[PDB]
Amino acid sequence: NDATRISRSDFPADFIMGTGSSAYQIEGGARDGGRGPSIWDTFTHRRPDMIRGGTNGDVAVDSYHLYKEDVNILKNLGLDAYRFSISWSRVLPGGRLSGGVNKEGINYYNNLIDGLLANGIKPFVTLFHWDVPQALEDEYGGFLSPRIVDDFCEYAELCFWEFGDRVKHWMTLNEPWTFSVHGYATGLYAPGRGRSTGNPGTEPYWVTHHLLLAHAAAVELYKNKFQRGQEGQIGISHATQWMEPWDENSASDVEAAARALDFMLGWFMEPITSGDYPKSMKKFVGSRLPKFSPEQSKMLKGSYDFVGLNYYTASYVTNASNFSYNTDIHVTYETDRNGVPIGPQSGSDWLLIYPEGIRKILVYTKKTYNVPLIYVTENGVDDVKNTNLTLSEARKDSMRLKYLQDHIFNVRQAMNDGVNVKGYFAWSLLDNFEWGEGYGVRFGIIHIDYNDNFARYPKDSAVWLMNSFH
Ligand SMILES: OC[C@H]1O[C@@H](O)[C@H](O)[C@@H](O)[C@@H]1O
């Protein structure tokens, strides 16, 4: 009943605990080892006004050079697994085969994977975590063009071929919701369209459509061409946020909350469940929502071995009072129920701590989508922004420790509920490059000293994880 007491021994023996990262956020060596640029290099370099402090991932926290140090920290941490992504423009600088296959980039991922394995840590590997190769962006518009589908398969194939003998858990995409909405609706993430210069009412829908197609076609490639020989599993990780009706007993708000789930999570989950978009998206987006061919529907339906969910926060939802994705949802998000916020702020004013949400999002996904195997692929919280603190003060992350305890507890509740969760990955292992927010937003269980070669030092939360989840 007390969440500070939660530990490995409240979970099945085969439950996988881990931490996470993504290539652009930690690797650095952006022009080292033959890596070609991604749309994020381009965004952060051409439009440093879009980044808090105008920073980028040229060096990030230097896991490109310090990977042996991350492996040692992961080993000391004692958790089962490490979720990281492959930088598409590292292994294929030009995005397609014709831009050349980068042997040194492959060698880096082999070294990381080998390091992880020699230390009993399972690699969980995401192919696409937003770093679309600039060459593809430039040649045809990246995910705006169906040409992205074939190129992504050839990339997935290269990765299965090179790494599949040792990597047994693959995700095609991480958070295409976030990628689609902030790249193409709000224009706040790479490639920064939407705020032809963009169109927030059409482009997010093509992007998501192509993302879904890319995902389906790479899953089919894995299933048909690698799975028998390699015996791994492939899925995808989705952005989630719990949507609670503003008024418990208002039919309108219950529908509004369900529509909000529909536009965020249903948007990707229904295609991979029934091969179509949610009814409410069809109704509210009309002719601006693309149709799948029957062949695409066959390919999308059931196209995963597992689904990863990413969870941070929650919101109340109510009905709303030219065209844009944001206005299509026809909802208004509310944070406060009569001056009572759904939960307290973290270091970020958008992250309201509501641990129960992770439980309701799990329960909701099993019910609505009937996913057989679920991983929490991301869950975590950011430190209050404060450059005044010494490391000993900074590393006492009480709020994170409680946040993890409380969420992990709720994951356990979801599993009692019937949700088959097979592991849980904290976001993140390292303080890292937090997209539009730069370095000031620290999600790590390992503190990074940005004044000193990105020195790693475990925060209280890492110590507790080691001691409680070995
Ligand atoms: O916002 C915190 C984190 O959110 C997750 O959805 C993304 O996958 C990470 O790349 C990001 O750093």
Short mmCIF file of C-alpha atoms and ligand atoms in Angstrom, two decimals:
data_model
loop_
_atom_site.label_atom_id
_atom_site.label_comp_id
_atom_site.label_asym_id
_atom_site.label_seq_id
_atom_site.Cartn_x
_atom_site.Cartn_y
_atom_site.Cartn_z
CA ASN A 1 0.00 0.00 0.00
CA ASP A 2 3.09 2.27 0.49
CA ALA A 3 4.85 3.07 -2.77
CA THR A 4 8.25 3.89 -1.18
CA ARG A 5 8.43 0.15 -0.50
CA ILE A 6 7.96 -0.99 -4.08
CA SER A 7 10.78 -3.22 -5.37
CA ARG A 8 11.69 -6.02 -7.80
CA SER A 9 10.05 -8.53 -5.52
CA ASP A 10 6.56 -7.10 -6.18
CA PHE A 11 6.98 -8.11 -9.88
CA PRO A 12 7.35 -11.37 -11.83
CA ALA A 13 10.83 -12.85 -12.11
CA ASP A 14 10.94 -12.03 -15.85
CA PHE A 15 9.98 -8.40 -15.47
CA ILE A 16 12.38 -6.17 -17.27
CA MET A 17 13.52 -2.93 -15.66
CA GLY A 18 15.53 -0.41 -17.56
CA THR A 19 16.37 3.15 -18.50
CA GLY A 20 16.44 4.98 -21.81
CA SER A 21 18.02 7.42 -24.21
CA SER A 22 17.76 8.46 -27.87
CA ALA A 23 20.61 9.01 -30.27
CA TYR A 24 20.26 12.68 -30.90
CA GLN A 25 19.74 13.44 -27.22
CA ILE A 26 22.96 11.81 -25.88
CA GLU A 27 25.34 10.71 -28.61
CA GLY A 28 27.02 13.83 -29.81
CA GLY A 29 29.73 13.04 -32.35
CA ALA A 30 27.20 14.54 -34.82
CA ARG A 31 29.83 14.89 -37.54
CA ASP A 32 32.11 12.17 -36.19
CA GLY A 33 32.54 8.62 -37.39
CA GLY A 34 30.88 9.47 -40.73
CA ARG A 35 27.46 10.47 -39.37
CA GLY A 36 25.35 12.55 -41.77
CA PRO A 37 23.07 15.31 -40.59
CA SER A 38 19.49 14.83 -39.34
CA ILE A 39 16.63 17.34 -39.50
CA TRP A 40 17.42 18.04 -35.83
CA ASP A 41 21.01 19.08 -36.58
CA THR A 42 19.54 21.33 -39.19
CA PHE A 43 16.79 22.71 -36.98
CA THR A 44 19.09 23.41 -34.00
CA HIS A 45 21.78 25.01 -36.24
CA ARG A 46 19.58 27.08 -38.59
CA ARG A 47 16.95 27.98 -36.03
CA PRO A 48 18.72 28.15 -32.68
CA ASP A 49 15.94 30.59 -31.63
CA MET A 50 13.65 27.49 -31.34
CA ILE A 51 15.87 25.99 -28.65
CA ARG A 52 16.02 27.31 -25.05
CA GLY A 53 19.64 28.67 -24.89
CA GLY A 54 20.14 28.10 -28.61
CA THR A 55 21.95 24.79 -28.02
CA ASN A 56 22.12 21.60 -30.08
CA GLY A 57 23.20 17.94 -30.05
CA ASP A 58 26.66 18.37 -31.69
CA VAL A 59 28.19 16.99 -28.46
CA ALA A 60 25.04 16.38 -26.35
CA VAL A 61 26.40 14.28 -23.43
CA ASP A 62 28.94 12.61 -25.65
CA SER A 63 27.75 8.99 -25.36
CA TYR A 64 29.34 8.60 -28.79
CA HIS A 65 32.81 8.71 -27.18
CA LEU A 66 31.72 7.83 -23.56
CA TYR A 67 29.64 4.77 -24.33
CA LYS A 68 32.01 2.61 -22.21
CA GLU A 69 31.31 4.89 -19.32
CA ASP A 70 27.51 4.59 -19.90
CA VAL A 71 27.90 0.82 -20.02
CA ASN A 72 29.81 0.88 -16.71
CA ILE A 73 27.11 3.08 -15.12
CA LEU A 74 24.43 0.76 -16.52
CA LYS A 75 26.32 -2.20 -15.01
CA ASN A 76 26.65 -0.49 -11.63
CA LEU A 77 22.93 0.46 -11.86
CA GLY A 78 22.12 -3.28 -12.06
CA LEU A 79 18.92 -2.99 -14.17
CA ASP A 80 18.09 -5.57 -16.89
CA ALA A 81 17.84 -3.52 -20.00
CA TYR A 82 18.75 -0.36 -21.83
CA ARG A 83 16.52 1.35 -24.41
CA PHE A 84 18.37 3.41 -26.96
CA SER A 85 17.84 4.38 -30.55
CA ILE A 86 19.95 4.08 -33.68
CA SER A 87 20.66 7.30 -35.53
CA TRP A 88 19.49 6.68 -39.09
CA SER A 89 21.98 9.24 -40.46
CA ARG A 90 24.84 7.62 -38.50
CA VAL A 91 24.58 4.21 -40.23
CA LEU A 92 23.28 5.70 -43.52
CA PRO A 93 24.59 9.27 -43.85
CA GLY A 94 22.36 9.91 -46.88
CA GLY A 95 19.37 8.07 -45.53
CA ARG A 96 19.09 5.75 -48.50
CA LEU A 97 21.58 3.06 -49.53
CA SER A 98 22.82 5.20 -52.38
CA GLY A 99 24.30 7.67 -49.88
CA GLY A 100 26.60 4.83 -48.67
CA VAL A 101 26.64 2.46 -45.72
CA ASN A 102 28.74 3.83 -42.85
CA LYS A 103 30.88 0.97 -41.45
CA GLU A 104 32.18 3.07 -38.51
CA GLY A 105 28.61 3.97 -37.48
CA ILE A 106 27.64 0.30 -37.54
CA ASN A 107 30.77 -0.39 -35.54
CA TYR A 108 29.72 2.03 -32.84
CA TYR A 109 26.34 0.31 -32.36
CA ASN A 110 28.09 -3.07 -32.38
CA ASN A 111 30.47 -1.81 -29.67
CA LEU A 112 27.59 -0.50 -27.60
CA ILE A 113 25.56 -3.73 -28.02
CA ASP A 114 28.57 -5.93 -27.24
CA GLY A 115 29.36 -3.77 -24.16
CA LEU A 116 25.77 -4.04 -22.97
CA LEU A 117 25.72 -7.82 -23.49
CA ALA A 118 29.08 -8.51 -21.87
CA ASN A 119 27.55 -6.83 -18.81
CA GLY A 120 24.21 -8.75 -18.83
CA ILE A 121 22.12 -5.82 -20.12
CA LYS A 122 19.52 -6.39 -22.80
CA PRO A 123 19.52 -3.87 -25.64
CA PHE A 124 16.07 -2.50 -26.61
CA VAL A 125 16.58 -0.64 -29.85
CA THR A 126 14.47 1.99 -31.54
CA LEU A 127 15.12 2.67 -35.24
CA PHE A 128 13.49 6.06 -35.48
CA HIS A 129 13.50 8.62 -32.70
CA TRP A 130 12.96 11.80 -34.78
CA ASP A 131 16.40 12.22 -36.38
CA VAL A 132 15.17 11.92 -39.98
CA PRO A 133 18.20 12.15 -42.27
CA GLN A 134 18.44 15.65 -43.72
CA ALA A 135 19.17 14.12 -47.13
CA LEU A 136 15.72 12.54 -47.18
CA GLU A 137 14.08 15.64 -45.80
CA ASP A 138 15.70 17.68 -48.57
CA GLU A 139 15.22 15.25 -51.41
CA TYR A 140 11.49 14.59 -50.96
CA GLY A 141 10.20 16.05 -47.70
CA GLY A 142 11.01 13.16 -45.40
CA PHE A 143 7.81 11.79 -43.85
CA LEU A 144 5.68 14.13 -45.97
CA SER A 145 6.31 11.80 -48.93
CA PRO A 146 5.37 8.12 -49.29
CA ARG A 147 8.95 7.76 -50.54
CA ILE A 148 9.93 7.59 -46.85
CA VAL A 149 8.34 4.10 -46.48
CA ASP A 150 10.75 2.23 -48.75
CA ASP A 151 13.81 4.08 -47.44
CA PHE A 152 12.93 3.37 -43.84
CA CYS A 153 12.52 -0.38 -44.67
CA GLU A 154 15.97 -0.47 -46.18
CA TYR A 155 17.26 1.11 -43.02
CA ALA A 156 15.34 -1.31 -40.79
CA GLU A 157 16.79 -4.15 -42.90
CA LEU A 158 20.36 -2.89 -42.52
CA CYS A 159 19.85 -2.77 -38.79
CA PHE A 160 18.28 -6.21 -38.54
CA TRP A 161 21.09 -7.60 -40.64
CA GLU A 162 23.93 -6.01 -38.69
CA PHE A 163 22.58 -6.15 -35.17
CA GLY A 164 19.70 -8.65 -35.13
CA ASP A 165 21.87 -11.65 -34.05
CA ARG A 166 22.32 -9.81 -30.69
CA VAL A 167 19.36 -7.35 -30.53
CA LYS A 168 16.07 -9.12 -29.77
CA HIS A 169 13.75 -6.22 -29.01
CA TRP A 170 13.07 -3.67 -31.73
CA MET A 171 10.83 -0.68 -31.99
CA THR A 172 10.30 0.93 -35.34
CA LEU A 173 9.23 4.29 -34.03
CA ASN A 174 9.28 6.30 -30.88
CA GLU A 175 6.42 8.83 -30.33
CA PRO A 176 5.37 9.48 -33.87
CA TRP A 177 2.53 11.49 -32.26
CA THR A 178 5.05 13.94 -30.89
CA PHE A 179 7.05 13.90 -34.09
CA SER A 180 3.98 14.53 -36.21
CA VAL A 181 2.29 17.14 -34.04
CA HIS A 182 5.30 19.25 -33.07
CA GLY A 183 7.02 19.01 -36.44
CA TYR A 184 3.97 19.71 -38.51
CA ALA A 185 1.16 21.21 -36.43
CA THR A 186 2.82 23.54 -33.84
CA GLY A 187 6.12 23.78 -35.72
CA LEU A 188 8.14 23.63 -32.50
CA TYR A 189 10.16 20.52 -33.26
CA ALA A 190 12.16 19.63 -36.35
CA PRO A 191 11.41 20.22 -39.22
CA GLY A 192 9.52 23.23 -37.79
CA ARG A 193 6.54 23.51 -40.13
CA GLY A 194 3.00 24.61 -39.29
CA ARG A 195 3.16 27.68 -36.86
CA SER A 196 4.61 25.75 -49.19
CA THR A 197 5.76 26.61 -45.68
CA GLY A 198 3.56 24.07 -43.88
CA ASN A 199 -0.13 23.57 -43.14
CA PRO A 200 -1.08 22.36 -39.65
CA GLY A 201 -4.41 21.08 -40.99
CA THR A 202 -3.05 18.69 -43.64
CA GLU A 203 0.63 17.89 -43.03
CA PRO A 204 0.37 16.25 -39.64
CA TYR A 205 -2.13 13.82 -41.16
CA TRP A 206 0.14 12.87 -44.10
CA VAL A 207 3.09 12.58 -41.73
CA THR A 208 1.28 10.24 -39.42
CA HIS A 209 -0.07 8.27 -42.36
CA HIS A 210 3.45 7.76 -43.75
CA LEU A 211 4.81 7.03 -40.25
CA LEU A 212 2.17 4.35 -39.87
CA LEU A 213 3.04 3.00 -43.33
CA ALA A 214 6.80 3.05 -42.57
CA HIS A 215 6.14 1.23 -39.33
CA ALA A 216 3.89 -1.39 -40.97
CA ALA A 217 6.28 -2.05 -43.79
CA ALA A 218 9.34 -2.38 -41.48
CA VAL A 219 7.36 -4.79 -39.23
CA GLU A 220 6.43 -6.86 -42.26
CA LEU A 221 10.10 -6.87 -43.28
CA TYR A 222 11.19 -8.03 -39.86
CA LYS A 223 8.42 -10.64 -39.52
CA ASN A 224 8.96 -12.06 -42.99
CA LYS A 225 12.70 -11.77 -43.40
CA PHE A 226 14.41 -11.78 -40.00
CA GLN A 227 12.16 -13.16 -37.23
CA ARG A 228 12.60 -16.86 -37.96
CA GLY A 229 16.41 -16.69 -38.08
CA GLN A 230 16.84 -14.07 -35.42
CA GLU A 231 13.98 -14.81 -32.98
CA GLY A 232 13.51 -11.24 -31.78
CA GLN A 233 10.39 -9.11 -31.38
CA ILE A 234 9.37 -5.82 -32.94
CA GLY A 235 6.97 -3.13 -31.76
CA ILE A 236 6.53 0.60 -31.50
CA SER A 237 6.44 3.21 -28.66
CA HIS A 238 3.58 5.73 -28.41
CA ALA A 239 3.13 9.07 -26.67
CA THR A 240 0.36 9.00 -24.09
CA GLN A 241 -1.11 11.46 -21.59
CA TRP A 242 -4.10 10.57 -19.50
CA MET A 243 -7.27 12.44 -20.44
CA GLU A 244 -9.71 12.77 -17.55
CA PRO A 245 -13.22 14.24 -18.14
CA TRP A 246 -13.29 17.69 -16.48
CA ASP A 247 -16.63 16.87 -14.94
CA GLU A 248 -16.81 13.20 -13.82
CA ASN A 249 -20.65 13.14 -14.58
CA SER A 250 -20.89 15.14 -17.90
CA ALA A 251 -21.63 13.06 -21.04
CA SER A 252 -19.98 15.85 -23.10
CA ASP A 253 -16.71 15.80 -21.10
CA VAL A 254 -16.59 11.95 -21.15
CA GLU A 255 -16.84 12.08 -24.97
CA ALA A 256 -14.30 14.95 -25.07
CA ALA A 257 -11.79 12.98 -22.97
CA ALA A 258 -12.32 9.92 -25.26
CA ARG A 259 -11.86 12.10 -28.35
CA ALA A 260 -8.62 13.46 -26.89
CA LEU A 261 -7.38 9.94 -26.35
CA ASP A 262 -8.61 9.16 -29.90
CA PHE A 263 -6.57 12.07 -31.48
CA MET A 264 -3.41 11.27 -29.53
CA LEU A 265 -3.19 7.58 -28.99
CA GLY A 266 -6.09 6.22 -31.20
CA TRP A 267 -4.51 7.97 -34.16
CA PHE A 268 -1.73 5.29 -34.20
CA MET A 269 -3.26 2.49 -32.13
CA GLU A 270 -6.42 2.00 -34.23
CA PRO A 271 -4.53 1.66 -37.54
CA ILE A 272 -2.41 -1.10 -36.00
CA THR A 273 -5.49 -2.62 -34.42
CA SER A 274 -8.14 -2.63 -37.12
CA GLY A 275 -6.27 -0.98 -40.00
CA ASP A 276 -8.30 2.25 -39.91
CA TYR A 277 -8.26 5.57 -38.01
CA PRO A 278 -10.68 6.13 -35.06
CA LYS A 279 -14.25 6.92 -36.01
CA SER A 280 -14.03 10.32 -34.25
CA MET A 281 -10.96 11.34 -36.31
CA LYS A 282 -12.72 10.34 -39.49
CA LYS A 283 -15.77 12.37 -38.48
CA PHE A 284 -13.86 15.49 -37.35
CA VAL A 285 -11.02 15.46 -39.92
CA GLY A 286 -13.21 14.45 -42.92
CA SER A 287 -11.47 14.57 -46.30
CA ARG A 288 -8.17 15.84 -44.84
CA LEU A 289 -7.55 12.37 -43.24
CA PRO A 290 -5.95 9.94 -45.77
CA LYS A 291 -7.49 6.56 -46.50
CA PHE A 292 -5.62 3.29 -46.36
CA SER A 293 -5.86 0.86 -49.28
CA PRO A 294 -7.10 -2.58 -48.32
CA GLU A 295 -3.51 -3.80 -48.78
CA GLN A 296 -2.20 -1.19 -46.35
CA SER A 297 -4.96 -2.04 -43.89
CA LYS A 298 -3.99 -5.73 -44.07
CA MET A 299 -0.33 -4.82 -43.45
CA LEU A 300 -1.11 -2.43 -40.50
CA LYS A 301 -3.59 -4.67 -38.63
CA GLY A 302 -1.75 -6.52 -35.85
CA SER A 303 1.64 -5.13 -36.86
CA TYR A 304 3.55 -5.51 -33.63
CA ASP A 305 4.84 -8.07 -31.23
CA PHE A 306 4.41 -5.51 -28.43
CA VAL A 307 3.54 -1.87 -27.83
CA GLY A 308 5.63 0.52 -25.76
CA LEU A 309 3.77 3.32 -23.97
CA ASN A 310 5.38 6.55 -22.87
CA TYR A 311 3.77 8.35 -19.97
CA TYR A 312 4.36 11.59 -18.15
CA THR A 313 1.22 13.44 -17.20
CA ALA A 314 -2.52 13.99 -17.45
CA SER A 315 -5.08 16.64 -18.17
CA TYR A 316 -8.76 17.34 -17.61
CA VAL A 317 -10.66 17.60 -20.90
CA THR A 318 -13.84 19.46 -21.96
CA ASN A 319 -15.62 20.24 -25.20
CA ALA A 320 -14.44 23.33 -27.25
CA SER A 321 -16.69 26.43 -27.98
CA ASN A 322 -8.71 27.95 -40.97
CA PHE A 323 -8.05 24.18 -40.38
CA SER A 324 -5.59 22.79 -37.80
CA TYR A 325 -4.87 19.45 -36.14
CA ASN A 326 -5.10 21.27 -32.79
CA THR A 327 -8.60 22.60 -33.48
CA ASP A 328 -9.74 19.33 -35.07
CA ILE A 329 -9.70 17.51 -31.72
CA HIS A 330 -12.50 19.93 -30.70
CA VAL A 331 -11.50 19.78 -27.06
CA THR A 332 -10.16 22.23 -24.45
CA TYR A 333 -7.58 20.98 -21.94
CA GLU A 334 -8.02 22.10 -18.34
CA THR A 335 -5.49 21.64 -15.54
CA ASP A 336 -7.59 22.70 -12.55
CA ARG A 337 -10.81 21.37 -11.01
CA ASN A 338 -12.01 24.41 -9.12
CA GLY A 339 -8.51 25.75 -8.35
CA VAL A 340 -7.25 22.20 -7.59
CA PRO A 341 -4.62 21.18 -10.25
CA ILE A 342 -4.84 17.55 -11.33
CA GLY A 343 -1.32 17.30 -9.85
CA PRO A 344 1.74 19.42 -8.86
CA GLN A 345 4.24 20.76 -11.39
CA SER A 346 7.62 19.15 -11.92
CA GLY A 347 10.45 21.34 -13.19
CA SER A 348 8.11 21.89 -16.19
CA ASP A 349 4.79 23.68 -16.07
CA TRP A 350 3.30 21.17 -18.62
CA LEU A 351 4.24 18.15 -16.47
CA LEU A 352 1.61 17.75 -13.77
CA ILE A 353 2.44 14.75 -11.54
CA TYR A 354 -0.55 12.40 -11.51
CA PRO A 355 0.74 8.85 -10.91
CA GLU A 356 -2.70 7.20 -11.42
CA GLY A 357 -2.62 8.28 -15.05
CA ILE A 358 0.01 5.67 -15.97
CA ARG A 359 -2.42 3.11 -14.49
CA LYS A 360 -5.48 4.43 -16.36
CA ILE A 361 -3.52 4.67 -19.68
CA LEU A 362 -2.44 1.00 -19.33
CA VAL A 363 -5.97 -0.12 -18.43
CA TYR A 364 -7.37 1.97 -21.31
CA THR A 365 -4.97 0.53 -23.91
CA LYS A 366 -5.76 -3.10 -23.01
CA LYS A 367 -9.48 -2.39 -23.13
CA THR A 368 -9.65 -0.27 -26.34
CA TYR A 369 -6.92 -1.93 -28.33
CA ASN A 370 -6.46 -5.35 -26.77
CA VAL A 371 -2.63 -5.27 -26.90
CA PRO A 372 -1.27 -8.56 -25.54
CA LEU A 373 2.22 -7.38 -24.44
CA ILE A 374 2.88 -3.85 -23.23
CA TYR A 375 6.08 -2.21 -22.05
CA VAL A 376 6.20 1.13 -20.34
CA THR A 377 8.98 2.32 -22.58
CA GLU A 378 9.17 5.77 -20.99
CA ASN A 379 8.20 7.31 -17.71
CA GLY A 380 10.05 9.96 -15.78
CA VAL A 381 10.21 13.51 -14.49
CA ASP A 382 12.46 16.63 -14.78
CA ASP A 383 14.29 18.48 -12.01
CA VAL A 384 13.45 21.98 -10.97
CA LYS A 385 15.68 24.32 -13.00
CA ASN A 386 18.48 25.57 -10.63
CA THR A 387 22.07 26.31 -11.59
CA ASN A 388 22.78 27.36 -7.95
CA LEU A 389 23.06 23.89 -6.52
CA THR A 390 26.26 21.90 -5.94
CA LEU A 391 26.20 18.29 -7.14
CA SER A 392 25.41 16.93 -3.64
CA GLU A 393 22.35 19.16 -3.43
CA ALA A 394 21.37 18.58 -7.10
CA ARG A 395 21.59 14.83 -6.93
CA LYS A 396 19.00 14.53 -4.05
CA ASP A 397 16.10 14.14 -6.46
CA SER A 398 13.31 13.53 -3.85
CA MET A 399 10.63 14.49 -6.32
CA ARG A 400 11.88 12.04 -8.99
CA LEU A 401 12.40 9.27 -6.47
CA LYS A 402 8.79 9.68 -5.37
CA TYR A 403 7.64 10.10 -8.99
CA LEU A 404 9.26 6.81 -10.02
CA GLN A 405 8.04 4.99 -6.87
CA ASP A 406 4.52 6.26 -7.41
CA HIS A 407 4.41 5.42 -11.12
CA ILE A 408 6.08 2.08 -10.80
CA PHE A 409 3.51 1.31 -8.12
CA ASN A 410 0.74 2.21 -10.53
CA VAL A 411 2.22 0.01 -13.21
CA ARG A 412 2.00 -2.80 -10.64
CA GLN A 413 -1.65 -1.77 -10.07
CA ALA A 414 -2.28 -1.92 -13.84
CA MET A 415 -0.84 -5.42 -13.92
CA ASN A 416 -3.20 -6.49 -11.07
CA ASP A 417 -5.96 -4.95 -13.25
CA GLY A 418 -5.04 -7.50 -16.00
CA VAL A 419 -2.69 -5.43 -18.13
CA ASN A 420 0.18 -7.57 -19.30
CA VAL A 421 3.15 -5.23 -18.79
CA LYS A 422 6.47 -6.98 -19.45
CA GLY A 423 8.87 -4.26 -18.34
CA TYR A 424 9.27 -0.58 -17.42
CA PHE A 425 11.87 1.89 -18.68
CA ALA A 426 12.60 5.15 -16.81
CA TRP A 427 13.20 8.19 -18.91
CA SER A 428 16.06 8.91 -18.85
CA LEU A 429 19.34 7.31 -17.82
CA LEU A 430 21.30 10.53 -18.44
CA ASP A 431 20.41 14.20 -18.23
CA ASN A 432 20.44 14.96 -22.00
CA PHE A 433 19.32 17.29 -24.79
CA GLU A 434 15.68 17.94 -24.15
CA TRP A 435 14.67 19.05 -27.63
CA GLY A 436 13.13 22.64 -27.77
CA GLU A 437 14.14 22.97 -24.09
CA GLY A 438 17.90 22.31 -24.42
CA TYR A 439 20.00 21.12 -21.47
CA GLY A 440 18.25 22.98 -18.61
CA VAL A 441 15.54 20.34 -18.32
CA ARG A 442 17.11 17.33 -16.52
CA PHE A 443 15.25 13.99 -16.81
CA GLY A 444 18.15 11.80 -15.84
CA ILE A 445 18.58 9.40 -12.99
CA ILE A 446 22.29 10.04 -13.61
CA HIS A 447 23.33 13.66 -13.19
CA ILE A 448 25.53 15.17 -15.91
CA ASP A 449 28.00 17.89 -15.06
CA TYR A 450 27.89 20.12 -18.19
CA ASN A 451 30.86 22.13 -16.86
CA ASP A 452 33.05 19.03 -16.69
CA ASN A 453 33.15 16.73 -19.76
CA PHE A 454 29.60 15.58 -18.93
CA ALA A 455 30.77 13.65 -15.85
CA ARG A 456 28.19 11.13 -14.75
CA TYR A 457 27.16 10.82 -11.13
CA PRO A 458 24.14 8.77 -9.95
CA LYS A 459 21.31 10.75 -8.36
CA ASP A 460 19.51 9.33 -5.25
CA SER A 461 16.95 7.93 -7.66
CA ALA A 462 19.56 5.73 -9.44
CA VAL A 463 20.83 4.41 -6.12
CA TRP A 464 17.33 3.52 -5.05
CA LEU A 465 16.64 1.84 -8.42
CA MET A 466 19.83 -0.24 -8.08
CA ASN A 467 19.08 -1.19 -4.49
CA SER A 468 15.40 -1.88 -5.08
CA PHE A 469 15.42 -3.36 -8.59
CA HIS A 470 18.69 -5.35 -9.06
O1 LIG B 1 9.77 15.13 -22.92
C1 LIG B 1 10.66 14.21 -22.32
C2 LIG B 1 10.92 13.06 -23.29
O2 LIG B 1 9.67 12.81 -23.88
C3 LIG B 1 9.64 11.64 -24.64
O3 LIG B 1 8.36 11.61 -25.21
C4 LIG B 1 10.64 11.65 -25.79
O4 LIG B 1 10.69 10.35 -26.37
C5 LIG B 1 12.02 12.07 -25.29
O5 LIG B 1 12.85 12.19 -26.43
C6 LIG B 1 11.88 13.35 -24.46
O6 LIG B 1 13.12 13.78 -23.97
#
